[PDB]
Every structure is written in structure tokens, then in C-alpha cells.
Design a binder for this molecule. Structure first.
Ligand SMILES: CCCCCCCCCCCCCC
Ligand SMILES: CCCCCCCCCCCCCC
Ligand SMILES: CCCCCCCCCCCCCC
Ligand SMILES: CCCCCCCCCCCCCC
Ligand SMILES: CCCCCCCCCCCCCC
Ligand SMILES: CCCCCCCCCCCCCC
Ligand SMILES: CCCCCCCCCCCCCC
Ligand SMILES: CCCCCCCCCCCCCC
Ligand SMILES: CCCCCCCCCCCCCC
Ligand SMILES: CCCCCCCCCCCCCC
Ligand SMILES: CCCCCCCCCCCCCC
Ligand SMILES: CCCCCCCCCCCCCC
Ligand SMILES: CCCCCCCCCCCCCC
Ligand SMILES: CCCCCCCCCCCCCC
Ligand SMILES: CCCCCCCCCCCCCC
Ligand SMILES: CCCCCCCCCCCCCC
Ligand SMILES: CCCCCCCCCCCCCC
Ligand SMILES: CCCCCCCCCCCCCC
Ligand SMILES: CCCCCCCCCCCCCC
Ligand SMILES: CCCCCCCCCCCCCC
Ligand SMILES: CCCCCCCCCCCCCC
Ligand SMILES: CCCCCCCCCCCCCC
Ligand SMILES: CCCCCCCCCCCCCC
Ligand SMILES: CCCCCCCCCCCCCC
Ligand SMILES: CCCCCCCCCCCCCC
Ligand SMILES: CCCCCCCCCCCCCC
Ligand SMILES: CCCCCCCCCCCCCC
Ligand SMILES: CCCCCCCCCCCCCC
Ligand SMILES: CCCCCCCCCCCCCC
Ligand SMILES: CCCCCCCCCCCCCC
Ligand SMILES: CCCCCCCCCCCCCC
Ligand SMILES: CCCCCCCCCCCCCC
Ligand SMILES: CCCCCCCCCCCCCC
Ligand SMILES: CCCCCCCCCCCCCC
Ligand SMILES: CCCCCCCCCCCCCC
Ligand SMILES: CCCCCCCCCCCCCC
Ligand SMILES: CCCCCCCCCCCCCC
Ligand SMILES: CCCCCCCCCCCCCC
Ligand SMILES: CCCCCCCCCCCCCC
Ligand SMILES: CCCCCCCCCCCCCC
Ligand SMILES: CCCCCCCCCCCCCC
Ligand SMILES: CCCCCCCCCCCCCC
Ligand SMILES: CCCCCCCCCCCCCC
Ligand SMILES: CCCCCCCCCCCCCC
Ligand SMILES: CCCCCCCCCCCCCC
Lengths: 196, 196, 196, 196, 196, 196
């Protein structure tokens, strides 16, 4: 019967949100965790052990894998999902201590609205900034043959990627998820400002 | 003794369903999870490391595995089981907030029936649409010898698959499960419309 | 103190069973799960990576492993243990809803006996049918040298199996478990019919 | 506060045991599980992939590993620990139903002593029978060089084992554990018979 | 309802801290655990099996990997996160016993402030000392080609690293986390001394 | 609210200990488990698959790894941590039954002090005995080149170890932990004897 203290903590955090934002934003978080943790994490398993190059030079497969992939795609999407969830965990931990100082005062407007807007504003800056770095570094597809011009390799060599079509399907799936997540946070910002 | 609040939430969600649909649709969900997570997930383990081709050309096994399998079968069935379960989780989260706004009103018809029909209708569209893509791309069997005509391979080569008979048994098992699941949702749509 | 509602659900399911069938049939289920999940699952680990053949032909080890093993033994025993446990989970979910419709009627013979006999009858049909398929396809032992006559292999080749003696010990262990499980369900059918 | 129903079930099972047998027999069970599950299970990891033989014949390493090891040592000790724990789980499940038929009779000598002696007698028969099979098949040490005379190998070959000294240390550790466990069950049989 | 004894233990430990140090220091601990346990732990997987050298000498890849990496980066960051968390667990276990001796005295200033300052002072000494060892041994980047002059290698050889650019991104991420963590503990020391 | 029966069992076990031994001995147990289970367990992963020797003789790497390492270092430290924790689990299980026989006597000095001293005395004998075996067999460092003179190897060969410097850092970390743990148990023996 000690679960009624959890119903008060969920009510204070979701006090300024709309009725349809509590539903579509929480199920989209579970969609992001299960898809990234089960399906897309194992396609990127043999990303280096199946990368091959057409050369005899020792040391040319180490430096040509590293020029193609400066950071992996599944470790760029894990860093992305933490930065967008930190302003929610920071604001949820802030309400818990505010409700504690006042609970031990009754037994013995304008403050919690400003900190709600700054947390929603930073979840949208982090979503746009991580989409522009990927558009600049990689793009939104993958080709099968790479052409490498590093050292110690002589002139130019041809190198071949591992599963370049299955990975392109999951790059476009994670683009639509982050564009729907960005559009639901802008609706949250518009409803608070245009109300009062 | 705090488990009697769970009996009220299960009663509201299953208010418009028949007596025999609550049984056959929930045990078929557990049948889908245990079969996919234990038996069929490990047959697809060495799908690329045991794919061989009859050539000396460097880079011909990378591009001929990718032409045969644009997406794996076990990652197409994980994406399928999430899309069919999202309209159930969206409707279950909608009833929880509707029962909350009314509970804090009594202590201090036509709305929940329309949203039930749209959730059942989308679980049947997602089952038919995922069956037509697999019929167009793959079929419903697998052969042992593949013939590949990509580049950099010269003319045509012969490539050999890993366990093509054991995988054909599990392709037909997952076809019958999705055809029984589609037939139980059409009976649900017919009982609601022909009642009132 | 909310565990006394579980004692009522266990009493209704086991109302038509004998006194000694509640003990010997539940410990035999745990014996089947722990033996299959710990001991026999890891002997079948390198079943393909240690299969060798005496040839130089590319593609002859792929097609001669697949002719020998159309389905693995540990994935045939996982499919077997689900089919025999589905009529128990279907009948246990049926009693839970029958006790719910009557509980909300008292606060605001001939039906549950017919569905008990049909569930016990289907656990014995599924045990006999899975034993006859294995007797027809495989047998109840394994030999060390296999002789293969598929294509692209020339004439006939010799192929060698991985651990053929340790696997034969566990084939006979899982045969005696399914013959004791079949004999305890026939005693259950004989006691219900010859009582009344 | 619903944990006081567990204190009654533990008191009925341990009613005929001595004061010092409840302590030394339960901690020795945890010693057997943690040692077998953590330390000895990973020494037997590369038991086949590091077995080598001094030959060029294809198929001679498959048949000479199998002649040396008809069953592995870590899968013979998992089968041993289940057979000795089954008479304890069968007797513990028997007391739970006997206390149930009598509890629903008071709210609406000579029987449980005979079944206690038969369960202790079978834990000692299973400990002696598993020690005599290992003395006949293997012994209680391991040598480094094996000499194999099977087919298709020509005449006799030399084969070399993986970690034969570290495995000999753990064979003697599991011998002393099963000899102390056998001696504590004979003291239990002597105290019940010589009391009354 | 037995969770109200946890609210008293959390209040005594955080009695001398500021209002904004309870929030920013606890979420930064979770940021350190999830980033180190999911993203950076798997980039360091094939650190030795993909290290290559341009030589034919047997034994030159063993001694040139060991000269480059005297201790791995992911095992130096696990040792770092335990040493900084030990003074928090030592002080939290000290308050629990102090509240116990006084609770069994009421039912049948200057002591807990000195031990709080010494625990905060040791979390800052351990953060600075682990940053100076890494600056002396490694630096804060990684290059792609290493030049090795050990024995048995003849003269000098060239050796090539595995993913030297992706690892450099995560070295700088874990530097900023430990510099923000060091700056939040110095603010804690300044607020206690300048208050009273 | 059923957690107040755990506060009585913890009070009886720690009745003869000092105030500062309850803190420093329990956090040092958690330091031993997390360090051994996370950091040092994975450095010893490729201990045999990266051991190389400068020979062409078949069977010389099997017998020269086994002469160098008669038992691994991480399996000698798991056996060590169980033997030192068995006298604590034996004494904790002894107090639980002594408090049971007396609880069912009140509702329907000199005994528990002798058994406390014998349990502390055996935790110090097991710590000294495991340190002397390692000093005799191995030492407290590891060198990079080993010289082997077994059979079937001709004359003498050179063999090379895997990570001999990172392992030497963790050998000295586990030496200081067992010397601090031995010094805290001797202080416990001195305080009981010199009190009364
Ligand atoms: C009675 C309130 C229960 C609170 C449960 C939710 C925890 C909120 C996050 C953790 C805050 C405290 C960290 C120590
Ligand atoms: C009165 C009930 C309080 C609200 C409980 C909500 C539970 C949220 C935490 C568990 C979420 C796990 C996914 C469903
Ligand atoms: C019984 C309901 C379970 C709902 C699905 C949860 C699946 C979690 C799997 C995550 C780990 C995947 C490992 C392959
Ligand atoms: C060596 C050439 C310059 C490196 C370019 C790659 C930079 C990638 C930056 C990715 C940062 C992602 C986390 C913010
Ligand atoms: C490769 C496995 C992916 C697992 C995803 C982990 C993401 C964790 C999200 C945590 C959200 C809270 C951040 C403070
Ligand atoms: C001051 C406590 C409440 C904080 C509200 C959330 C603020 C969001 C800050 C996000 C900054 C992210 C930096 C990594
Ligand atoms: C090389 C051809 C690649 C074809 C890309 C197909 C991508 C389909 C992804 C579907 C995304 C829709 C999300 C709702
Ligand atoms: C090769 C790149 C193809 C990109 C096509 C997909 C663009 C996404 C448009 C739909 C986004 C939906 C936002 C709500
Ligand atoms: C008292 C009601 C308990 C509700 C438990 C079921 C949770 C329903 C899904 C989670 C909804 C709340 C998400 C924060
Ligand atoms: C009054 C009881 C409420 C209904 C409880 C149903 C439990 C459903 C959640 C757990 C399902 C796990 C598989 C059985
Ligand atoms: C490069 C040739 C065209 C690619 C054909 C493969 C398309 C596969 C589409 C699978 C989509 C499955 C998720 C909807
Ligand atoms: C390869 C392991 C398969 C595990 C299956 C995971 C499926 C998860 C289903 C989740 C249903 C809820 C979706 C919102
Ligand atoms: C509005 C809240 C209730 C939603 C009911 C379920 C609607 C189903 C929508 C499914 C759309 C799936 C898109 C991926
Ligand atoms: C190459 C021959 C393949 C034979 C296919 C056999 C498929 C049997 C599957 C049984 C499915 C029945 C589900 C109830
Ligand atoms: C090679 C493809 C063979 C397909 C045969 C199986 C067809 C499935 C018919 C039975 C479906 C049952 C639906 C209830
Ligand atoms: C009060 C009754 C508790 C029932 C617990 C056992 C659950 C029975 C199986 C699950 C049936 C409900 C599925 C949603
Ligand atoms: C009154 C007690 C109800 C019966 C409880 C039986 C528990 C069965 C579920 C847990 C089984 C786990 C293996 C012992
Ligand atoms: C403490 C009682 C435990 C009883 C034995 C349970 C062992 C479960 C092991 C199953 C996983 C095996 C992984 C090797
Ligand atoms: C290609 C030759 C015919 C295939 C024979 C193998 C059939 C195996 C059927 C196994 C079915 C097991 C699940 C019912
Ligand atoms: C290879 C691991 C074996 C694990 C056995 C899993 C068997 C699951 C049995 C589930 C019984 C209920 C079926 C509806
Ligand atoms: C109608 C609800 C009760 C069902 C009782 C059990 C019937 C057993 C049916 C088994 C059929 C198995 C088909 C896969
Ligand atoms: C090639 C010789 C194989 C010998 C077979 C031995 C099988 C013993 C199995 C014991 C089964 C008894 C179950 C109680
Ligand atoms: C090579 C096959 C040998 C089979 C011998 C074992 C036959 C099993 C007879 C005993 C079964 C016990 C049933 C209760
Ligand atoms: C109130 C009694 C609780 C019993 C808990 C111990 C369970 C005993 C073993 C399981 C017996 C019931 C199996 C369904
Ligand atoms: C009155 C207390 C009943 C006895 C509780 C004993 C617990 C035994 C089950 C848990 C054992 C786990 C290892 C300690
Ligand atoms: C915190 C007390 C834990 C007691 C030791 C339990 C260790 C269990 C480890 C079993 C799995 C081993 C995997 C390497
Ligand atoms: C093929 C030569 C005869 C086989 C001898 C090996 C028999 C091993 C029997 C082990 C049985 C252990 C489980 C009872
Ligand atoms: C290789 C992992 C070893 C794990 C040991 C599992 C032993 C399970 C013992 C179960 C005792 C109850 C038997 C009915
Ligand atoms: C009849 C219910 C009580 C059983 C008491 C324990 C008897 C022990 C029988 C052990 C037989 C083991 C055969 C595998
Ligand atoms: C080849 C030399 C092997 C030496 C065997 C040493 C065995 C020591 C085992 C100690 C067992 C004692 C258990 C208490
Ligand atoms: C090579 C075999 C050596 C066996 C020596 C060990 C014999 C065990 C004697 C001590 C047993 C202790 C029983 C309580
Ligand atoms: C009633 C107080 C509950 C305390 C829970 C927190 C435990 C504090 C750390 C453990 C201290 C005791 C170690 C045996
Ligand atoms: C009155 C509530 C006491 C405070 C509860 C705080 C819970 C902290 C322990 C669990 C933390 C897990 C991460 C949220
Ligand atoms: C053999 C040459 C001297 C070794 C230099 C490497 C010393 C690394 C010390 C790292 C200590 C980190 C834990 C404190
Ligand atoms: C490689 C996996 C990393 C997991 C991190 C473990 C860190 C444990 C921190 C424990 C803090 C308490 C120390 C006493
Ligand atoms: C005396 C009990 C309270 C201790 C307070 C914390 C003191 C911090 C000591 C840290 C020393 C770290 C040595 C490894
Ligand atoms: C070889 C070029 C490496 C480029 C380094 C880029 C490092 C970016 C790390 C961003 C750290 C910011 C933390 C907030
Ligand atoms: C090659 C090394 C580059 C280091 C540049 C980063 C220095 C970090 C400065 C910002 C630290 C923020 C502390 C709050
Ligand atoms: C009411 C007392 C609860 C006891 C919990 C601690 C268990 C002590 C170790 C287990 C002893 C009983 C083993 C069956
Ligand atoms: C009155 C509170 C009793 C003492 C509780 C101590 C808990 C010890 C067991 C859990 C330890 C886990 C590591 C903190
Ligand atoms: C074959 C040469 C004699 C063997 C010497 C190695 C003995 C190692 C004994 C280690 C015992 C550790 C557990 C007590
Ligand atoms: C390799 C993983 C190490 C895990 C350590 C397990 C140690 C278990 C300690 C158990 C203490 C109780 C012994 C009776
Ligand atoms: C008699 C019950 C209390 C036992 C107290 C602890 C005695 C310590 C005995 C340790 C012996 C270790 C032998 C492996
Ligand atoms: C070959 C040179 C090895 C250098 C050894 C350095 C060991 C440092 C270990 C620090 C241990 C201190 C524990 C507090
Ligand atoms: C090569 C061996 C070097 C050993 C040096 C370390 C000796 C440990 C002395 C400090 C021990 C601290 C005990 C409290």
C-alpha cells in the first residue's frame, strides 16, 4: 500500500504538460530503447572483422577502417539517448527535493514553471545538434566500396564494407524517430507560451 | 494488498472484448516471444561467417551476401512484433490517464469505444503489410545454391548458404502464427460491429 | 499478506487430480528445464564449426551438414517442451476468468470437468507425435562417420561428426523423461473416467 | 508480514534431523553450487579447440577426442548434483500438500517418518553410484599425452590434452566434497534408527 | 509502508550539503556508470587481437603490445570509480550505526561534521591523483603508428593500433566528466568552511 | 514492515565486535568482490590463446603452458574468497537456529562466545596459508620470456606470455587487500581476549 506516494510525484512533474503529450512521448522512449538494444545492436557486431581491403601491405586495413568510421553508428546513438534524457532526470530530481522541504514544514507559482521550460528547451537543442553532426560527417546512407588514400598504403586501394544495405535501413529508421521526437517537443513549447 | 488496483485497470481495457479472445490472444503473445527469443535466434548465428563462394576475387563474398540478404529474417521479425504491440500499449496508457482524471473528481459511452476500434484496426493493417513485403522480397523458403552477378566479381559465381533446411522449417512456423493472429483480430472486429 | 489469493487459484486448477500426481508431475517439469538449459545446451555448441569432410571441393561441407541434420536436436526439444505446456497455460488462464465473473456476482458441475479432460488428452497426443517423428527422421543414436551423396560433391565423401558419444548419452536421457511423462498422464486419464 | 507462513514449512521438514545437520548440510550445498558455477566451469572451456594430435589424416582429431572423453567432467557433475537434490525436492513438496489438507480441516505419527528415511537413503545410494562410475571410466587424475588407436587413423598417434594439471586439482576438490557429503548422511541415518 | 525508515537515513547523510549539490552530484554518478558500462566498454574489445606489427620474428607482437599499454584504459577507469566512491560508502555505513546506538537508547554537534569533511577531502585527492598518473603515462590522445625497440625484435619495428580515433573521442569525454566532478566537490568544501 | 526481524539477527552476530570493525570489514568485502568480478577477470581472458612459443614441434605449446601455470591466478583468488567467507556463513547460520529454539520457548553466556573466537581464528589461518602457497609456487611478479624444458620439445625453447605487466599490477593490488584484511582480524582477536 506504499505505492500511493508515487502517484503524487508523477502528478507534480506532469502538471504543465498537455493531455496527449504524456502518452505519445513515453511510448516513444520505450520504442527507442528496445529497437536500439535488440535489433540494431547486433547488425553492427562484425563491423571490423569483416572489413576487407585489396592489398598486401601490412597495416593498411587498420588505417583504412579508421578513416572510414571515426565513430561507430551504434555508439553515436547511445551517446545521443543519454544527452536527451539528462534534462528529464535533472528536473525530476529537483521536484523530489522541493516536495520534501515543504512536506516537513506542513507537518512540524513562478518557480517550478521556469525550470520546466528550460528543461524542454534543452531536449530540443540536443536533438538538432546531434542531427547536424551526422549530416556533416556521414550522411544518411552507406556505400559498398570505399577508396582510401592514407599511409602506409601505396597510392589508392579499394576496401569493402560489411552489410551496407541492412545498415542503411536502420539509419533511416532512427532518423524518423528523432524527427517525430523533435516535433512533439516543439508542440509542448507552443502550448505553454500561448496559454499564459 | 496493493494489487487490487491492478484488477481495475485490467477490467477497463478488456471491457469490449469477447470471453474467448482474452485467452487465445494473450497466450499466443507468449508463444511468439519464447519461440523467437530461444529457438530461432541462435539458428541465425553464423549466417555470414559460414556463407562461402567459389571465387578468388577479393571483395566478392561481401557484395554477394548483401545482394542475397538485404535484411535478416530475425531482425525483420523483431521489427514486426513491436509494430503490432504499439497500438496495445498506446491504448493501455490512454485508459490509465482517463481513470486518473475521474478518480480525483469523485473524491475531491462513445469515447472509449471509438479508440478501441482504431487500435484493433491498426493491429490488422500492420500484420497484412508485413506479410506482403516478405512475399515480395524473399518468398517462403530458402535454396542452397545462390547465383550472384554483382561487381567486382567476374561474370557469375556460385555461393552457398548456411543451414538452408532448418531455416525453412522456422519460416513456415512464423507464417502460421501470424495467420492465426490475423484471424483472431478479425473476429474481434466482427463482434463489436454486429452487436451495436 | 496478499498471497492468500494465490492459494485459491491453485486449488481450483488441481481439483480433479489425484494426490500423487500433483507431486511427480511438477518436479519432473523442473527436471526437464534445468537439464535442457544447463547441461545439454552447451554440448551442441560447436556442432557446425567442428564438422569436417574429406574433400577439396568448395561448398561440400555446407550441403553435407544440412543433409545430415535437417533440424538440430536441442531446437527440436525446445519446440517439444512448449507444445506440451500450452494446454496447461490455456486451462489455467480459463479458470482465472471464470473465478472473476463469479466473484463480482457474489459481492455486488459439468463445465470445468470437460475442459480439464481435453487439456490432458492433448498433452498426451503431443508427446506421442513428437516421439514418432524423431524415430522416423533420426533414430535414437548417432554414428561417427557419415557418407554424403549430394551436389556439388563428386561421387561420395566421408564426413566426421562432433562428439558423437556424449550426444548419444543425452538422447537416451531425454527419451526416458518423455516416457515417464507420458505414463503419468495416462494414469490421470484413467482415474477420472473410472471414478465417475 | 507474510513471511511467518514460511517458518512453519521449514519446521515440519526439519523435524527429525539433528541440531548440527541443519547447519553443515546446507552450507555444503552452497559451496557446491558456487564452486561449480564460477571456478571449474571456465577451465573446461577450450577442451576441444585446444586438443591437438600429431597427424595429417583428416578426421583423426574428431575420433580421438571422443575416445578419450565419452562424457565431459563438468557435465557429469551437473547431472550428479540434480539426482542428489531430487529426493529433497520431492519430500519438501510432499509436506506442503499434507499441511494443506489438514489446515482446511481444522478451520472449516508413522506416516511422515517413513518417507523421510527413504529420501535420505536415496541421497546416499546416488552418491556412491556416481563415484563408482567415475572410478571405472576415468580414475582420479589426468595425463598429458594420450595414445589413440581408432579408425581412420593409421597405426597409433600421439594426442595432447588441454590444461591437464589444473583439471587434476579440481578433480580432487570435487572428490573430497562428495565424501564429506556422504559421511553426513550416514550420521543422519544412524541417529534416527538408534533413537526409536 | 516500510520505506519511511529510508527517508531518515537519507536526511542525516545529506544534512551538511547545499541544496544544489544533492542534484548535480547524483545524476553525474549515473552518467559515469552508464557511459562506461555500455558505450566505452565495447570499443576496447579487440584491443590485442587487432594489434599488428610489420615483422616475422616470433614473440615481437607480445612484447610490443605490452610496452605500448602497461594498463588498459577501461581498467584504469574502473579502478578510478571505486576509489572515489569508497569514502561515500564508508561515511554512509558510519551514520547507520550511529543512528542505531541512539535509537535503542531513546526507546529503552561536532562529531558527525568532522567525519564529513574528511570524506569530501579524500574524494578530491583521489580525483587529482588519478589525473596526474594518466598525464604522465599516456597523455590525452592516441596515435596510429607506434615504434617499438624491445627484445627479441631486431632494431626497430612499426606497429599499428586498433581504432585510434574513436578511442581519442572517449578519452576526452572522460576527462571533462572528472573535471566537472572535481569542481563540484571544491564548492562543497568552500560552503562548509565559510558558513561556520 | 516485516524487516524488523532482520535487525535482531544482525545485532546478535555483531555483539562481541568493536565499533570500528563492523565498518571497515564489510566495505572491504565489497571492494574484493567488485574488483575481482569486473576488472581482473577480463585481463585473464586470452591467457592460453595468446601464449606463443618459438618451435615447430606439435604438442610443445600444450605442455609448456601447463608447466608455467599449474593453476590460474583468477581461479586461485576465487577459491581463496570462499574459504575465508565459510566461517562467517557457518556462524551466522548457527545463531539463527539458537534464536529459534528460544523464541518458541518464551512464547509457548559462555556458549556463543567460544564459537565466535573459533570462527575468527579460522579466517586468519586461511589468509596466511593461501599467501604462503602463492609465495612458494609463483612469487609476486611475472616475467615476459619463459624457458621450458619438458617433453616432446627438443632441448630448450623460448615461450612468451600474454600481458605480463598489467597482470603484475593486479597481483600487487590483491596482496595489499589480503594484508589489510589479515591485520583487521588480529585486532579483533586482541580486543576480545584483553577485555575479559
Ligand atoms: C516517497 C517518494 C519515493 C520516491 C521514489 C522516486 C525516487 C526519485 C528519484 C530518486 C531521488 C532520491 C535519490 C537519492
Ligand atoms: C498510483 C500509481 C503510480 C503510478 C505508477 C506508474 C509506474 C511507473 C514506473 C514503472 C514504469 C515501468 C513501465 C510500465
Ligand atoms: C513478457 C513480456 C516481455 C516483453 C519483451 C521484453 C523483451 C526484453 C528483451 C531485451 C533483451 C534482448 C536480448 C536478446
Ligand atoms: C582525424 C580527422 C578529424 C576527425 C574527424 C572526425 C570527428 C568526429 C567527431 C564526432 C564527435 C561525436 C561526439 C560529439
Ligand atoms: C547497446 C545497448 C543500448 C542500451 C541503451 C542504454 C541507454 C540508457 C538510457 C539512459 C537514460 C537516462 C540517462 C541519464
Ligand atoms: C537546477 C535543477 C533543475 C534543473 C532543470 C533542468 C535544467 C536542464 C539543464 C540541462 C543541461 C545539460 C548539460 C549537459
Ligand atoms: C539500398 C536501398 C535501400 C532501401 C532503403 C529502404 C528504407 C526503408 C526504411 C523504412 C523507414 C520507414 C519508417 C516508418
Ligand atoms: C537517402 C536519404 C533518404 C531520406 C528520406 C526520408 C526523409 C524523411 C521524411 C519523413 C520524416 C517524417 C518526419 C515526421
Ligand atoms: C494504481 C495503478 C497502477 C498502474 C500500474 C500499471 C501502469 C500502467 C502503465 C504505466 C502508466 C504510467 C507511466 C508513467
Ligand atoms: C487481481 C489480480 C490482477 C490481475 C493480475 C494479472 C497479472 C498480469 C501481469 C503479470 C503477467 C505475467 C505473466 C503471467
Ligand atoms: C538496393 C536494391 C534495393 C533494395 C531492396 C531491398 C529493400 C528491402 C526493404 C525492407 C524494408 C523492411 C522494413 C520495412
Ligand atoms: C532477439 C530477441 C527477441 C526478443 C523479442 C523482443 C520483442 C519486444 C516486444 C516488445 C513489445 C512492446 C512494444 C512497444
Ligand atoms: C490517442 C491515445 C489512444 C491511441 C489509441 C491507439 C491508436 C493506434 C495508433 C497506431 C498508430 C501506429 C503508428 C506507428
Ligand atoms: C526442404 C523440405 C522442408 C520441409 C518443410 C517442413 C515444414 C514443417 C513445418 C511444420 C509447420 C506446422 C506448424 C503447426
Ligand atoms: C512453400 C510454402 C508452403 C506453405 C504451406 C503452408 C500454408 C499455410 C496454410 C495453413 C495456414 C493456417 C492458417 C490458420
Ligand atoms: C488475485 C489473482 C492473482 C492472479 C495471479 C496469477 C495470474 C494468472 C495468469 C495471468 C492471468 C491474467 C493475465 C493478464
Ligand atoms: C498459499 C500459498 C500459495 C501457493 C504458493 C505456491 C508458489 C508457486 C509459484 C512459485 C513456484 C516457484 C518454484 C517453487
Ligand atoms: C541457490 C539455489 C540455486 C539453485 C540452482 C539454480 C541454478 C540456475 C542456473 C541456470 C543458468 C545456468 C547458467 C550456466
Ligand atoms: C529436403 C528433404 C525433406 C526434408 C526432410 C526433413 C523434414 C524434417 C521435418 C521436421 C519437422 C519438425 C517440426 C515439426
Ligand atoms: C536453450 C534454453 C532452453 C530453455 C527452455 C525454455 C522452455 C520454455 C518453456 C515455456 C513453457 C510455457 C510455454 C507456453
Ligand atoms: C477454451 C479455453 C480452455 C482451453 C482448455 C485447453 C484446450 C487445449 C487445446 C490445445 C490445442 C493446442 C493447439 C496448438
Ligand atoms: C556408444 C555407447 C553409448 C553408451 C550409452 C550409455 C547410455 C546411458 C544413459 C543412461 C540413461 C539412464 C537414465 C536413467
Ligand atoms: C539404442 C536405443 C537404446 C534404447 C534403450 C532404452 C529403452 C528405454 C526402456 C526404458 C524406458 C523406461 C520407461 C518408464
Ligand atoms: C504459504 C506457504 C508458502 C509456500 C512457499 C513454498 C513453496 C513450496 C514449494 C512449491 C509448492 C507449490 C507448487 C505449486
Ligand atoms: C521465519 C523466517 C523463515 C525462514 C526464512 C529462511 C529463508 C530461506 C530461503 C532463502 C534462502 C536464501 C539463502 C540464504
Ligand atoms: C554481494 C554478495 C554477493 C555474493 C557473491 C555472489 C557471486 C555470484 C556470482 C555468480 C556468477 C559468476 C559469474 C562470473
Ligand atoms: C563406445 C564405447 C562404450 C562407451 C563407454 C562410455 C560409457 C560412459 C557412460 C557414462 C554414463 C554417465 C551417465 C550415467
Ligand atoms: C554449469 C553451471 C552449473 C550450475 C549448477 C546447476 C545445478 C542445479 C541444481 C538444482 C537442484 C534442484 C534439482 C531438482
Ligand atoms: C511420495 C512423495 C514423497 C517422496 C519422498 C521421496 C522419495 C525419494 C524417491 C527418489 C527416487 C529417485 C528416482 C529418480
Ligand atoms: C600433477 C600434480 C597435481 C598435484 C595435485 C594437488 C591437489 C591438491 C588439491 C587439494 C585438495 C584439498 C581439499 C581440501
Ligand atoms: C590420485 C588420487 C589421490 C587421492 C588422494 C585423496 C584421497 C582423499 C582422502 C581424504 C578424503 C576425506 C574424506 C572425509
Ligand atoms: C531501517 C534502516 C534500513 C537500512 C537500509 C540501508 C542499509 C545501509 C547500508 C547497510 C548497512 C548494514 C550492513 C549490514
Ligand atoms: C521517502 C523515500 C526515501 C528516498 C527513496 C530514494 C530511493 C534511493 C534508492 C533507489 C535509487 C535508484 C535510482 C533512482
Ligand atoms: C616496466 C616499466 C615500468 C612500468 C611503467 C608502467 C607503470 C604503470 C603504473 C600504473 C599504476 C596504475 C594504478 C595505480
Ligand atoms: C566494465 C563494466 C563497468 C561497470 C562499473 C562498475 C563500477 C562499480 C562502482 C561501485 C561503487 C562502489 C564502490 C565501493
Ligand atoms: C571512521 C568511519 C567513517 C569514515 C569516514 C570516511 C573516511 C574516508 C577514508 C578514505 C580512506 C580511503 C583509503 C583507501
Ligand atoms: C583525431 C581527431 C579527434 C577529434 C577529437 C574530437 C573530440 C570531441 C569530444 C567532445 C567532448 C565534449 C564533451 C562535452
Ligand atoms: C589533446 C587534448 C585536448 C584537450 C582539450 C580539452 C580541455 C578541456 C577544457 C574544458 C574542461 C571543462 C572543465 C569544466
Ligand atoms: C525472521 C528471520 C529471517 C531470517 C532471514 C535471514 C536468513 C538467515 C540465513 C538462512 C537460514 C535459514 C536457511 C534455511
Ligand atoms: C533494521 C534494518 C536491518 C538491517 C538491514 C541491513 C541490510 C543488509 C542486507 C543487504 C545488504 C546489501 C548491501 C547494502
Ligand atoms: C606436477 C608437478 C607438481 C605440481 C605442482 C603444482 C602444485 C600446485 C598446487 C596448488 C594448490 C592450490 C589449491 C590449494
Ligand atoms: C570470476 C567471478 C568472481 C565472482 C566471485 C564469487 C565469489 C563468491 C563468494 C561467496 C562467499 C560465500 C562463500 C560461502
Ligand atoms: C558449529 C556451528 C558453528 C560453527 C562456527 C564456525 C566454525 C568454523 C569452522 C571452519 C572450518 C572450515 C573447514 C573448511
Ligand atoms: C613492471 C613494472 C611494474 C610496476 C608495478 C606497479 C605496481 C603499482 C601497484 C599499486 C598498488 C598500490 C595499492 C594501494
Ligand atoms: C615485487 C614485490 C613488491 C612488493 C612490494 C609491496 C609490499 C607491500 C607492503 C605494504 C603492505 C601494506 C600492509 C598494510
Amino acid at each position: 500500500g506504499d505505492w500511493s506516494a508515487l502517484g503524487k510525484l508523477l502528478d507534480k512533474v506532469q502538471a504543465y504538460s498537455t493531455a496527449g503529450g504524456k502518452v505519445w512521448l513515453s511510448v516513444l522512449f520505450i520504442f527507442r530503447i528496445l529497437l536500439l538494444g535488440t535489433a540494431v545492436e547486433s547488425a553492427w557486431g562484425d563491423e571490423q572483422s569483416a572489413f576487407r581491403c585489396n592489398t598486401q601491405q601490412p597495416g593498411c586495413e587498420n588505417v583504412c577502417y579508421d578513416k572510414s568510421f571515426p565513430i561507430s553508428h551504434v555508439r553515436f546513438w547511445v551517446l545521443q539517448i543519454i544527452f536527451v534524457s539528462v534534462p528529464t532526470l535533472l528536473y525530476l530530481a529537483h521536484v523530489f527535493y522541493v516536495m520534501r522541504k515543504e512536506e516537513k514544514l506542513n507537518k512540524k507559482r513562478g518557480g517550478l514553471l521556469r525550470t520546466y521550460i528550460i528543461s524542454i528547451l534543452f531536449k530540443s537543442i540536443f536533438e538538432v545538434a546531434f542531427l547536424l553532426i551526422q549530416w556533416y560527417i556521414y550522411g544518411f546512407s552507406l556505400s559498398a566500396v570505399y577508396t582510401c588514400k592514407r599511409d602506409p598504403c601505396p597510392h589508392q586501394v579499394d576496401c569493402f564494407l560489411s552489410r551496407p544495405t541492412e545498415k542503411t535501413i536502420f539509419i533511416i529508421f532512427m532518423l524518423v524517430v528523432s524527427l517525430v521526437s523533435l516535433a512533439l517537443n516543439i508542440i509542448e513549447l507552443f502550448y505553454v507560451f500561448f496559454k499564459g
